[PDB]
Amino acid sequence: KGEELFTGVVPILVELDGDVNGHKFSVSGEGEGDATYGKLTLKFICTTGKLPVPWPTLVTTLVQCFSRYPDHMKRHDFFKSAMPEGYVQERTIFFKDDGNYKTRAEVKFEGDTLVNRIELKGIDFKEDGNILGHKLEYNYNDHQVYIMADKQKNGIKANFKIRHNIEDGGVQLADHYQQNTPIGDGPVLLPDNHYLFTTSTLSKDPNEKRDHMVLLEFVTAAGI
């Protein structure tokens, strides 16, 4: 089983290559995950300069295999069952009255490390909007993810809203549409519909001078 590969603390590598309205950038993340408790600690660095989009808008893009799946639904864990070969994770994210991100990522083990490798393309963004204009608060409003099976492609799908607080009043809406399919061929668990509940805390490394985001996350799956 792929679930075995998560019994301990697992190092996490994240790598994003991004293009939004022609502003190209890269993001690297390193940290570790504990699926037994459902805990992620990661530090992200924009390794090419200033991040041209706000850090919270990338949170969902930047490893649901680390969700704590209890004992009674260790069998609906599609994300772990796909390991080590892993899965493709694709999204479109509509920023209301603004552009959209399209993301394709591969989530897999490379040696002992869980690696989330992402390409991100963003189009139709307003240059003085909340994204390209950096008008969103540095914080997070988590949202639950209702995970439904997708027997057709043999993976799962979800759609959910993320709310970003706008520095001067609004809420910026980020409409997420997600589908996941296994990379490998072997048997994979197809879950009964269930929820993923996530708690995210954003913070800053006082000794770090590059543009960056420290992220602490707790996540659990739930029935009904």
Side-chain angles (χ1 to χ4, degrees), residues 1-125 127-165 167-224:
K1 270 318 301 308
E3 307 182 315
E4 206 306 327
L5 306 177
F6 296 81
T7 47
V9 173
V10 166
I12 299 165
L13 166 63
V14 186
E15 295 287 357
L16 187 142
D17 186 56
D19 186 349
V20 181
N21 278 29
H23 306 272
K24 294 159 174 181
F25 63 90
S26 198
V27 166
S28 274
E30 309 194 332
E32 48 199 339
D34 179 328
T36 283
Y37 195 47
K39 182 166 113 106
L40 306 167
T41 56
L42 295 158
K43 179 177 167 187
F44 295 98
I45 298 175
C46 172
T47 56
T48 57
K50 211 232 184 308
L51 191 66
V53 305
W55 273 113
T57 76
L58 302 185
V59 166
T60 46
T61 296
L62 299 171
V63 287
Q64 288 159 309
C65 47
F66 284 104
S67 46
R68 185 233 198 192
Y69 270 73
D71 268 322
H72 85 91
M73 304 163 79
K74 264 147 168 112
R75 197 231 346 249
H76 300 330
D77 205 343
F78 151 90
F79 309 101
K80 293 192 188 54
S81 69
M83 280 326 127
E85 314 92 338
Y87 56 82
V88 166
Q89 170 156 315
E90 284 165 345
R91 292 217 184 89
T92 299
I93 298 164
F94 295 92
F95 290 93
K96 185 153 152 44
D97 295 331
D98 214 328
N100 68 92
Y101 296 162
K102 297 214 144 69
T103 73
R104 190 197 182 273
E106 292 194 18
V107 189
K108 67 178 108 167
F109 272 86
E110 288 175 4
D112 276 344
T113 301
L114 196 277
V115 183
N116 174 16
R117 190 164 297 274
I118 312 130
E119 280 248 71
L120 176 148
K121 176 112 211 69
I123 69 201
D124 295 352
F125 274 98
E127 267 283 359
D128 198 38
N130 302 330
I131 283 79
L132 283 202
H134 289 98
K135 294 182 187 171
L136 303 187
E137 289 169 12
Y138 190 78
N139 52 23
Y140 212 71
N141 279 308
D142 283 285
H143 197 280
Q144 76 220 269
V145 176
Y146 181 66
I147 285 194
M148 315 174 264
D150 201 59
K151 215 212 190 129
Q152 303 16 112
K153 272 186 122 154
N154 200 32
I156 56 97
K157 46 194 214 311
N159 63 112
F160 60 91
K161 289 187 154 43
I162 294 298
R163 272 145 191 120
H164 303 303
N165 293 118
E167 254 149 7
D168 290 327
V171 150
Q172 175 71 64
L173 182 73
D175 205 18
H176 286 60
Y177 298 86
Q178 171 180 349
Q179 70 197 341
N180 282 48
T181 84
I183 289 168
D185 276 335
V188 86
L189 321 160
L190 269 202
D192 270 23
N193 302 357
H194 65 289
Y195 280 110
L196 292 184
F197 296 126
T198 301
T199 307
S200 300
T201 308
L202 309 200
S203 64
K204 295 288 197 188
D205 177 2
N207 300 338
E208 177 64 63
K209 70 300 166 189
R210 306 161 263 181
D211 206 1
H212 70 291
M213 174 177 73
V214 177
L215 172 93
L216 170 63
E217 209 154 72
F218 304 92
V219 52
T220 186
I224 87 163

